[PDB]
Amino acid sequence: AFDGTWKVDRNENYEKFMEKMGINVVKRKLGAHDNLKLTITQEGNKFTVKESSNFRNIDVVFELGVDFAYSLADGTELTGTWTMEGNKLVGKFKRVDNGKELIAVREISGNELIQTYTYEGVEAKRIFKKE
Incomplete structure (x- = not known):
């Protein structure tokens, strides 16, 4: 389900989203290679x-x-x-x-x-792999 640790694998149109958000060129390159890891745990509706x-x-x-x-x-x-x-x-x-x-x-x-994000007509995705 959502439980577990997820590590970013690839992005789609992410630098275009960051650009739309007002993020500068250098920071966009850093952002696209941020090694993001998400550890998700649930406790009821929280x-x-x-x-x-x-x-x-x-x-x-x-x-x-x-x-x-x-x-x-x-x-x-x-x-x-x-x-x-x-x-x-x-x-x-x-x-x-x-x-x-x-x-x-x-x-x-x-x-x-x-x-998937959407902002001002731009869509970007960050896709994670389990573990």
Whole structure:
């Protein structure tokens, strides 16, 4: 299901998303090779997602359907929720600075975890492999 440790394997259109977000060229190259690892654990409707990357190591804790504050690695602050829609995790955020929507979807495909973002008409994915 979502339980376990996932390590990023490949990206699709990620540098275009970062560019749209306002991230500079150098930082985009760093971001695309961030060695991101996610450790996901659940306790009821609450999730703990431990993010470990070249940039930071932080624990992200949220209750499904309850709004919370989250910052992207780059420093952009967001607010919104995660909900379970069928078997996918759907995140509906807003940037605190500009009020624009950022949608994140996390869904299992075979044995991979595909995270899809959407922001201002651009879509990017980061696909993880289990273990």
